[PDB]
mmCIF file of C-alpha atoms in Angstrom:
data_model
loop_
_atom_site.group_PDB
_atom_site.id
_atom_site.type_symbol
_atom_site.label_atom_id
_atom_site.label_comp_id
_atom_site.label_asym_id
_atom_site.label_seq_id
_atom_site.Cartn_x
_atom_site.Cartn_y
_atom_site.Cartn_z
ATOM 1 C CA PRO A 1 7.958 32.298 -3.131
ATOM 2 C CA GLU A 2 7.594 30.394 -6.539
ATOM 3 C CA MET A 3 4.248 29.365 -7.893
ATOM 4 C CA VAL A 4 2.877 26.410 -10.155
ATOM 5 C CA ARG A 5 -0.989 26.263 -10.705
ATOM 6 C CA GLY A 6 -2.161 29.350 -8.653
ATOM 7 C CA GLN A 7 -0.459 28.090 -5.485
ATOM 8 C CA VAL A 8 2.786 28.684 -3.473
ATOM 9 C CA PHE A 9 5.400 25.951 -4.000
ATOM 10 C CA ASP A 10 8.055 27.368 -1.828
ATOM 11 C CA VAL A 11 11.063 25.076 -1.553
ATOM 12 C CA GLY A 12 13.976 27.326 -2.093
ATOM 13 C CA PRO A 13 16.854 27.803 -2.650
ATOM 14 C CA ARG A 14 17.745 24.191 -2.709
ATOM 15 C CA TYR A 15 15.126 22.999 -5.044
ATOM 16 C CA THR A 16 14.493 24.818 -8.375
ATOM 17 C CA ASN A 17 13.000 24.509 -12.026
ATOM 18 C CA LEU A 18 9.716 23.006 -10.801
ATOM 19 C CA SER A 19 7.454 21.066 -13.065
ATOM 20 C CA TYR A 20 3.783 20.086 -12.164
ATOM 21 C CA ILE A 21 3.250 16.346 -11.674
ATOM 22 C CA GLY A 22 -0.338 16.108 -10.314
ATOM 23 C CA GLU A 23 -2.418 16.159 -7.191
ATOM 24 C CA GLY A 24 -1.984 18.022 -1.777
ATOM 25 C CA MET A 25 0.279 19.185 -4.807
ATOM 26 C CA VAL A 26 3.224 17.231 -6.348
ATOM 27 C CA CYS A 27 6.099 18.583 -8.401
ATOM 28 C CA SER A 28 9.410 17.502 -9.814
ATOM 29 C CA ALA A 29 12.209 19.891 -8.947
ATOM 30 C CA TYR A 30 15.871 20.171 -9.554
ATOM 31 C CA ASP A 31 17.891 19.430 -6.364
ATOM 32 C CA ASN A 32 21.047 21.844 -6.424
ATOM 33 C CA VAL A 33 22.896 19.879 -3.708
ATOM 34 C CA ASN A 34 22.617 16.253 -5.236
ATOM 35 C CA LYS A 35 22.530 17.222 -8.945
ATOM 36 C CA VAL A 36 19.348 15.121 -9.751
ATOM 37 C CA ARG A 37 15.648 15.999 -10.233
ATOM 38 C CA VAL A 38 13.457 15.018 -7.155
ATOM 39 C CA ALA A 39 9.836 14.619 -6.348
ATOM 40 C CA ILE A 40 8.306 17.063 -3.794
ATOM 41 C CA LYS A 41 4.852 16.871 -2.325
ATOM 42 C CA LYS A 42 3.471 19.858 -0.584
ATOM 43 C CA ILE A 43 1.140 18.687 2.283
ATOM 44 C CA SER A 44 -1.305 21.076 4.049
ATOM 45 C CA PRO A 45 -2.856 19.002 6.799
ATOM 46 C CA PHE A 46 -3.077 21.244 9.761
ATOM 47 C CA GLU A 47 -6.863 22.182 9.534
ATOM 48 C CA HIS A 48 -8.148 18.610 9.532
ATOM 49 C CA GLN A 49 -7.061 16.192 12.305
ATOM 50 C CA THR A 50 -7.433 13.087 10.098
ATOM 51 C CA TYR A 51 -4.911 14.788 7.597
ATOM 52 C CA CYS A 52 -2.541 15.337 10.697
ATOM 53 C CA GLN A 53 -2.799 11.748 11.859
ATOM 54 C CA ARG A 54 -1.968 10.386 8.466
ATOM 55 C CA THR A 55 0.809 12.897 7.776
ATOM 56 C CA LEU A 56 2.406 12.006 11.079
ATOM 57 C CA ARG A 57 2.262 8.258 10.411
ATOM 58 C CA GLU A 58 3.747 8.706 6.764
ATOM 59 C CA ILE A 59 6.537 10.802 8.297
ATOM 60 C CA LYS A 60 7.324 8.642 11.365
ATOM 61 C CA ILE A 61 7.313 5.392 9.427
ATOM 62 C CA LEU A 62 9.318 6.402 6.278
ATOM 63 C CA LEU A 63 11.995 8.153 8.512
ATOM 64 C CA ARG A 64 12.471 5.018 10.479
ATOM 65 C CA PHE A 65 12.472 2.450 7.464
ATOM 66 C CA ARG A 66 15.510 1.919 5.410
ATOM 67 C CA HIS A 67 14.841 -0.462 2.450
ATOM 68 C CA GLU A 68 15.472 -0.498 -1.283
ATOM 69 C CA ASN A 69 11.810 -1.315 -2.104
ATOM 70 C CA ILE A 70 10.384 1.427 0.271
ATOM 71 C CA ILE A 71 10.371 4.977 -0.842
ATOM 72 C CA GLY A 72 12.664 7.247 1.546
ATOM 73 C CA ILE A 73 12.254 10.704 2.647
ATOM 74 C CA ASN A 74 15.164 12.750 1.353
ATOM 75 C CA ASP A 75 14.289 15.938 2.965
ATOM 76 C CA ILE A 76 11.291 17.731 4.611
ATOM 77 C CA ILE A 77 10.815 21.525 4.159
ATOM 78 C CA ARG A 78 8.901 23.543 6.575
ATOM 79 C CA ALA A 79 8.949 27.041 8.451
ATOM 80 C CA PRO A 80 11.438 27.466 11.394
ATOM 81 C CA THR A 81 8.608 27.909 13.956
ATOM 82 C CA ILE A 82 5.273 26.112 14.756
ATOM 83 C CA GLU A 83 3.590 29.599 14.347
ATOM 84 C CA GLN A 84 4.827 29.947 10.757
ATOM 85 C CA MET A 85 4.411 26.379 9.635
ATOM 86 C CA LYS A 86 1.321 26.102 7.362
ATOM 87 C CA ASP A 87 2.484 23.358 5.032
ATOM 88 C CA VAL A 88 5.167 20.576 5.039
ATOM 89 C CA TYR A 89 7.039 19.698 1.767
ATOM 90 C CA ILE A 90 8.301 16.092 1.544
ATOM 91 C CA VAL A 91 11.170 15.513 -0.869
ATOM 92 C CA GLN A 92 11.574 12.024 -2.395
ATOM 93 C CA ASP A 93 13.491 10.288 -5.234
ATOM 94 C CA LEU A 94 11.823 10.932 -8.555
ATOM 95 C CA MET A 95 10.141 7.906 -9.985
ATOM 96 C CA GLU A 96 9.329 7.669 -13.862
ATOM 97 C CA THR A 97 5.905 6.114 -13.334
ATOM 98 C CA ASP A 98 3.646 3.899 -10.921
ATOM 99 C CA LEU A 99 2.151 0.576 -11.436
ATOM 100 C CA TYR A 100 -1.371 2.194 -11.881
ATOM 101 C CA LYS A 101 -0.269 4.295 -14.854
ATOM 102 C CA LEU A 102 1.849 1.410 -16.283
ATOM 103 C CA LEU A 103 -1.188 -0.877 -16.230
ATOM 104 C CA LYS A 104 -3.325 1.536 -17.975
ATOM 105 C CA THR A 105 -0.841 1.756 -20.960
ATOM 106 C CA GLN A 106 1.563 -1.235 -20.971
ATOM 107 C CA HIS A 107 1.437 -5.068 -21.328
ATOM 108 C CA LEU A 108 3.712 -6.508 -18.674
ATOM 109 C CA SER A 109 5.855 -9.524 -19.867
ATOM 110 C CA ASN A 110 5.886 -12.556 -17.517
ATOM 111 C CA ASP A 111 9.429 -11.639 -16.472
ATOM 112 C CA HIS A 112 8.365 -7.990 -15.563
ATOM 113 C CA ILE A 113 5.330 -9.439 -13.440
ATOM 114 C CA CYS A 114 7.715 -11.807 -11.695
ATOM 115 C CA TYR A 115 10.252 -9.060 -10.850
ATOM 116 C CA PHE A 116 7.547 -6.567 -9.662
ATOM 117 C CA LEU A 117 5.897 -9.166 -7.450
ATOM 118 C CA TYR A 118 9.384 -10.056 -5.957
ATOM 119 C CA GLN A 119 10.108 -6.324 -5.194
ATOM 120 C CA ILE A 120 6.682 -5.910 -3.739
ATOM 121 C CA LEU A 121 7.069 -8.975 -1.389
ATOM 122 C CA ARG A 122 10.613 -8.108 -0.551
ATOM 123 C CA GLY A 123 9.543 -4.678 0.653
ATOM 124 C CA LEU A 124 6.536 -6.213 2.456
ATOM 125 C CA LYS A 125 8.792 -8.673 4.263
ATOM 126 C CA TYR A 126 10.541 -5.646 5.802
ATOM 127 C CA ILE A 127 7.258 -3.810 6.704
ATOM 128 C CA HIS A 128 5.625 -6.840 8.300
ATOM 129 C CA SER A 129 8.991 -7.553 10.102
ATOM 130 C CA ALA A 130 8.600 -4.131 11.761
ATOM 131 C CA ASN A 131 5.044 -5.338 12.919
ATOM 132 C CA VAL A 132 3.606 -2.574 10.592
ATOM 133 C CA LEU A 133 0.567 -3.134 8.204
ATOM 134 C CA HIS A 134 0.569 -0.872 5.159
ATOM 135 C CA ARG A 135 -3.248 -1.201 4.755
ATOM 136 C CA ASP A 136 -3.423 0.564 1.461
ATOM 137 C CA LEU A 137 -1.469 -1.583 -1.118
ATOM 138 C CA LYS A 138 -2.541 -0.829 -4.668
ATOM 139 C CA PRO A 139 -1.001 -0.144 -8.010
ATOM 140 C CA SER A 140 -0.814 3.648 -7.615
ATOM 141 C CA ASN A 141 1.201 3.131 -4.351
ATOM 142 C CA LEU A 142 3.847 1.189 -6.127
ATOM 143 C CA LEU A 143 6.404 3.558 -7.721
ATOM 144 C CA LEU A 144 8.770 2.455 -10.694
ATOM 145 C CA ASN A 145 11.793 4.093 -12.188
ATOM 146 C CA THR A 146 13.142 3.791 -15.835
ATOM 147 C CA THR A 147 14.940 0.465 -14.941
ATOM 148 C CA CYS A 148 11.826 -0.930 -13.313
ATOM 149 C CA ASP A 149 12.965 -0.690 -9.661
ATOM 150 C CA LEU A 150 9.966 -0.672 -7.511
ATOM 151 C CA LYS A 151 9.225 1.195 -4.284
ATOM 152 C CA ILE A 152 6.276 1.070 -2.010
ATOM 153 C CA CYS A 153 4.897 4.385 -0.960
ATOM 154 C CA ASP A 154 2.053 6.094 1.130
ATOM 155 C CA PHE A 155 1.997 4.760 4.647
ATOM 156 C CA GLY A 156 -0.571 7.301 5.659
ATOM 157 C CA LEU A 157 -3.129 4.541 6.439
ATOM 158 C CA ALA A 158 -0.680 2.215 8.165
ATOM 159 C CA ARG A 159 -1.063 0.551 11.606
ATOM 160 C CA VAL A 160 0.883 -1.571 14.080
ATOM 161 C CA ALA A 161 -0.409 -5.072 13.801
ATOM 162 C CA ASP A 162 -2.815 -6.218 16.434
ATOM 163 C CA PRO A 163 -4.204 -9.717 15.761
ATOM 164 C CA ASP A 164 -5.916 -10.109 19.189
ATOM 165 C CA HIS A 165 -8.084 -7.048 18.574
ATOM 166 C CA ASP A 166 -8.926 -7.804 14.982
ATOM 167 C CA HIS A 167 -12.454 -9.093 15.398
ATOM 168 C CA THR A 168 -15.615 -6.848 14.726
ATOM 169 C CA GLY A 169 -19.091 -7.048 13.234
ATOM 170 C CA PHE A 170 -20.637 -7.245 9.672
ATOM 171 C CA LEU A 171 -20.450 -4.539 6.974
ATOM 172 C CA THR A 172 -18.713 -2.047 9.286
ATOM 173 C CA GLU A 173 -15.087 -1.606 8.162
ATOM 174 C CA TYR A 174 -13.506 0.358 5.192
ATOM 175 C CA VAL A 175 -9.815 -0.588 5.441
ATOM 176 C CA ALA A 176 -7.780 -0.116 2.054
ATOM 177 C CA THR A 177 -9.158 1.039 -1.198
ATOM 178 C CA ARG A 178 -12.229 -0.991 -2.325
ATOM 179 C CA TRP A 179 -11.015 -3.087 -5.203
ATOM 180 C CA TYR A 180 -7.937 -4.334 -3.007
ATOM 181 C CA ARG A 181 -9.830 -4.926 0.247
ATOM 182 C CA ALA A 182 -9.946 -8.445 1.690
ATOM 183 C CA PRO A 183 -13.269 -10.352 2.035
ATOM 184 C CA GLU A 184 -12.938 -10.378 5.890
ATOM 185 C CA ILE A 185 -13.086 -6.563 6.071
ATOM 186 C CA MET A 186 -16.703 -6.693 5.151
ATOM 187 C CA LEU A 187 -17.483 -9.716 7.346
ATOM 188 C CA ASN A 188 -15.635 -9.645 10.723
ATOM 189 C CA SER A 189 -12.196 -8.004 10.522
ATOM 190 C CA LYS A 190 -10.755 -4.525 11.564
ATOM 191 C CA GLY A 191 -7.750 -5.101 9.145
ATOM 192 C CA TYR A 192 -5.248 -5.421 12.030
ATOM 193 C CA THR A 193 -3.435 -8.549 10.802
ATOM 194 C CA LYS A 194 -0.625 -8.974 8.085
ATOM 195 C CA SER A 195 -3.082 -11.163 5.969
ATOM 196 C CA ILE A 196 -4.812 -7.922 4.966
ATOM 197 C CA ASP A 197 -1.882 -6.880 2.933
ATOM 198 C CA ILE A 198 -1.236 -10.240 1.340
ATOM 199 C CA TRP A 199 -4.814 -10.033 -0.108
ATOM 200 C CA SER A 200 -3.996 -6.630 -1.587
ATOM 201 C CA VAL A 201 -0.757 -8.136 -3.202
ATOM 202 C CA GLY A 202 -2.872 -10.917 -4.681
ATOM 203 C CA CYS A 203 -5.133 -8.389 -6.270
ATOM 204 C CA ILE A 204 -2.085 -6.552 -7.675
ATOM 205 C CA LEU A 205 -0.810 -9.740 -9.062
ATOM 206 C CA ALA A 206 -4.104 -10.544 -10.729
ATOM 207 C CA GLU A 207 -4.276 -7.016 -12.163
ATOM 208 C CA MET A 208 -0.611 -7.389 -13.629
ATOM 209 C CA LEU A 209 -1.681 -10.673 -15.371
ATOM 210 C CA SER A 210 -4.590 -8.996 -17.394
ATOM 211 C CA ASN A 211 -4.448 -5.145 -16.953
ATOM 212 C CA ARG A 212 -7.765 -5.133 -15.343
ATOM 213 C CA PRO A 213 -8.791 -5.130 -11.659
ATOM 214 C CA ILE A 214 -9.895 -8.577 -10.597
ATOM 215 C CA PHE A 215 -12.624 -7.567 -8.071
ATOM 216 C CA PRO A 216 -13.959 -4.179 -9.568
ATOM 217 C CA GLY A 217 -16.675 -3.668 -7.084
ATOM 218 C CA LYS A 218 -18.759 -0.649 -8.374
ATOM 219 C CA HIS A 219 -19.381 0.359 -4.626
ATOM 220 C CA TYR A 220 -18.520 -0.816 -1.079
ATOM 221 C CA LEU A 221 -21.327 -3.503 -1.000
ATOM 222 C CA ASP A 222 -20.454 -4.809 -4.529
ATOM 223 C CA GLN A 223 -17.044 -5.863 -3.367
ATOM 224 C CA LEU A 224 -18.016 -9.182 -1.701
ATOM 225 C CA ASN A 225 -20.081 -10.061 -4.795
ATOM 226 C CA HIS A 226 -17.041 -9.871 -6.990
ATOM 227 C CA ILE A 227 -14.812 -11.824 -4.638
ATOM 228 C CA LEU A 228 -17.287 -14.548 -3.977
ATOM 229 C CA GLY A 229 -18.105 -14.575 -7.745
ATOM 230 C CA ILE A 230 -14.545 -15.683 -8.518
ATOM 231 C CA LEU A 231 -13.645 -17.752 -5.284
ATOM 232 C CA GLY A 232 -17.072 -19.332 -5.034
ATOM 233 C CA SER A 233 -18.955 -20.219 -1.885
ATOM 234 C CA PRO A 234 -16.714 -20.494 1.293
ATOM 235 C CA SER A 235 -16.330 -24.052 2.787
ATOM 236 C CA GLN A 236 -17.981 -25.209 5.850
ATOM 237 C CA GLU A 237 -14.618 -24.858 7.697
ATOM 238 C CA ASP A 238 -14.111 -21.319 6.473
ATOM 239 C CA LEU A 239 -17.531 -20.397 7.695
ATOM 240 C CA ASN A 240 -17.084 -21.972 10.999
ATOM 241 C CA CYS A 241 -14.244 -19.608 11.502
ATOM 242 C CA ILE A 242 -16.717 -16.719 11.166
ATOM 243 C CA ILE A 243 -18.473 -16.875 14.654
ATOM 244 C CA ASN A 244 -20.416 -13.640 14.183
ATOM 245 C CA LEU A 245 -23.938 -14.575 13.248
ATOM 246 C CA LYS A 246 -25.076 -11.634 11.044
ATOM 247 C CA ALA A 247 -21.803 -12.295 8.826
ATOM 248 C CA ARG A 248 -22.202 -16.122 8.971
ATOM 249 C CA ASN A 249 -25.834 -16.196 8.137
ATOM 250 C CA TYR A 250 -25.416 -13.557 5.332
ATOM 251 C CA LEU A 251 -22.890 -15.887 3.648
ATOM 252 C CA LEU A 252 -25.273 -18.988 4.257
ATOM 253 C CA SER A 253 -28.211 -17.118 2.539
ATOM 254 C CA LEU A 254 -26.291 -16.889 -0.715
ATOM 255 C CA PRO A 255 -26.963 -19.442 -3.521
ATOM 256 C CA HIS A 256 -24.121 -21.875 -4.028
ATOM 257 C CA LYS A 257 -21.406 -20.407 -6.383
ATOM 258 C CA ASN A 258 -18.504 -22.566 -7.845
ATOM 259 C CA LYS A 259 -14.939 -21.406 -7.968
ATOM 260 C CA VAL A 260 -13.845 -19.834 -11.295
ATOM 261 C CA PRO A 261 -10.489 -21.532 -12.150
ATOM 262 C CA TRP A 262 -7.501 -19.090 -12.341
ATOM 263 C CA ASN A 263 -6.388 -20.677 -15.638
ATOM 264 C CA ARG A 264 -9.730 -19.774 -17.329
ATOM 265 C CA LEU A 265 -9.552 -16.135 -15.974
ATOM 266 C CA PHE A 266 -5.813 -15.855 -16.885
ATOM 267 C CA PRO A 267 -5.166 -18.141 -19.884
ATOM 268 C CA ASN A 268 -1.745 -16.507 -20.694
ATOM 269 C CA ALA A 269 -0.311 -16.691 -17.292
ATOM 270 C CA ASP A 270 2.442 -18.699 -15.881
ATOM 271 C CA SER A 271 1.082 -21.749 -14.020
ATOM 272 C CA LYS A 272 3.485 -21.029 -11.070
ATOM 273 C CA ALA A 273 2.094 -17.439 -10.939
ATOM 274 C CA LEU A 274 -1.449 -18.804 -10.593
ATOM 275 C CA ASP A 275 -0.452 -21.229 -7.880
ATOM 276 C CA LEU A 276 0.930 -18.266 -5.914
ATOM 277 C CA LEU A 277 -2.111 -16.124 -6.755
ATOM 278 C CA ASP A 278 -4.496 -18.860 -5.389
ATOM 279 C CA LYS A 279 -2.559 -18.797 -2.106
ATOM 280 C CA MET A 280 -2.625 -15.056 -1.705
ATOM 281 C CA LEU A 281 -6.372 -14.856 -2.604
ATOM 282 C CA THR A 282 -7.350 -17.405 -0.017
ATOM 283 C CA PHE A 283 -10.711 -16.555 1.464
ATOM 284 C CA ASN A 284 -9.794 -17.640 5.011
ATOM 285 C CA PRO A 285 -7.207 -15.147 6.281
ATOM 286 C CA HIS A 286 -5.701 -17.842 8.655
ATOM 287 C CA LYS A 287 -4.902 -20.080 5.615
ATOM 288 C CA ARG A 288 -3.673 -17.232 3.338
ATOM 289 C CA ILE A 289 -0.026 -17.412 2.594
ATOM 290 C CA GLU A 290 2.432 -15.127 4.580
ATOM 291 C CA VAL A 291 5.039 -12.847 3.040
ATOM 292 C CA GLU A 292 8.021 -15.078 3.820
ATOM 293 C CA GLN A 293 6.197 -18.191 2.305
ATOM 294 C CA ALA A 294 5.252 -16.069 -0.729
ATOM 295 C CA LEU A 295 8.915 -15.131 -1.301
ATOM 296 C CA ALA A 296 9.899 -18.819 -1.044
ATOM 297 C CA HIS A 297 7.209 -19.858 -3.689
ATOM 298 C CA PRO A 298 8.652 -21.509 -6.908
ATOM 299 C CA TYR A 299 7.367 -18.598 -8.999
ATOM 300 C CA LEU A 300 9.993 -16.343 -7.374
ATOM 301 C CA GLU A 301 12.821 -18.951 -7.407
ATOM 302 C CA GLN A 302 14.962 -16.821 -9.871
ATOM 303 C CA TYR A 303 15.178 -13.980 -7.310
ATOM 304 C CA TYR A 304 14.609 -15.661 -3.850
ATOM 305 C CA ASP A 305 17.472 -15.128 -1.412
ATOM 306 C CA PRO A 306 16.473 -14.686 2.192
ATOM 307 C CA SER A 307 19.952 -13.270 3.108
ATOM 308 C CA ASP A 308 19.144 -10.508 0.701
ATOM 309 C CA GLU A 309 15.694 -9.868 1.937
ATOM 310 C CA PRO A 310 16.216 -7.796 5.016
ATOM 311 C CA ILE A 311 14.182 -7.151 8.004
ATOM 312 C CA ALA A 312 13.715 -4.210 10.263
ATOM 313 C CA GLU A 313 16.119 -3.686 13.198
ATOM 314 C CA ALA A 314 13.220 -3.363 15.745
ATOM 315 C CA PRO A 315 9.386 -3.527 15.683
ATOM 316 C CA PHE A 316 7.461 -0.268 15.837
ATOM 317 C CA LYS A 317 5.436 0.337 18.934
ATOM 318 C CA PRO A 318 -5.835 16.610 18.817
ATOM 319 C CA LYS A 319 -4.766 18.602 15.869
ATOM 320 C CA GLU A 320 -2.611 20.904 17.973
ATOM 321 C CA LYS A 321 -0.487 18.377 19.752
ATOM 322 C CA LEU A 322 -0.223 16.540 16.325
ATOM 323 C CA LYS A 323 1.043 19.733 14.704
ATOM 324 C CA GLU A 324 3.761 19.878 17.469
ATOM 325 C CA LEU A 325 4.651 16.157 16.832
ATOM 326 C CA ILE A 326 4.938 16.745 13.066
ATOM 327 C CA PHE A 327 7.196 19.779 13.892
ATOM 328 C CA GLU A 328 9.286 17.670 16.271
ATOM 329 C CA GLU A 329 9.524 14.732 13.829
ATOM 330 C CA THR A 330 10.687 17.112 10.920
ATOM 331 C CA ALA A 331 13.409 19.048 13.038
ATOM 332 C CA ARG A 332 16.255 16.946 11.883
ATOM 333 C CA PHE A 333 16.009 18.502 8.325
ATOM 334 C CA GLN A 334 16.545 21.973 9.538
ATOM 335 C CA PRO A 335 20.000 23.754 9.084
ATOM 336 C CA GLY A 336 22.594 22.604 11.652
#
């Protein structure tokens, strides 16, 4: 049972020569069957039902999805019995970096931004075509290899779309990571519609243009301040779509704010990029561009090819039962 930083990282004999990547616990490791180094994440969820729920989602989703811009699961390592299974190891293609790391260190050329956005939306087209919402799109969930191929990861927070049951009250909901969370999450939305993901993609695009998050809320309640600071006050029509009174009257209480023009925030950006940005960062989720429209936008004309933007074959529909389900869902990787 081999070790790394005072912890068992027991993957053998198939996977050897381990190197620590970061934080469960992630390592690269040489795959002795396919002669390539891989990523391996050790997952230890069984003593927290929230960790079991998220692990089971990640697994079920990534096993069913097959797409060039979505990370696959190559293998899953665990004990032969439920009794002996204390951790699960998920083996994935090794990726050089992620968009979070790249944005901290690298200027992106306009051609890189265009290509990354294409790949993000291409992958999202498939996810949304399966009636699945990722719900946590952000730079660190976008993996990149040495040739800038891009793969979406971490479906632990995903849900099946449910637009008829999206409505809720004011300042309740926490969907996504704060800086990438759509304005309606704080107002009246449970984050059960596809427009939640498009907002996050818009935030990612903005961040690619300037290497800084566009809406860096310092805490949960600051996030709407940042969003409204740039988009300005919502129109009468967009307010009328918010029937809830606590949310509507909060917005009516605010002093008028004008829109900050994208070309002033992003003076070096491609004008077509800012036109698409505007449409993804639309306040009213009903008016926000959808993934298929975004793909068809002039900014992406060099790549757009709907016959090469595939869709999923069919839509997707307590701790101890979840441990059994995770055991069942991982059985295909056991010998024979």
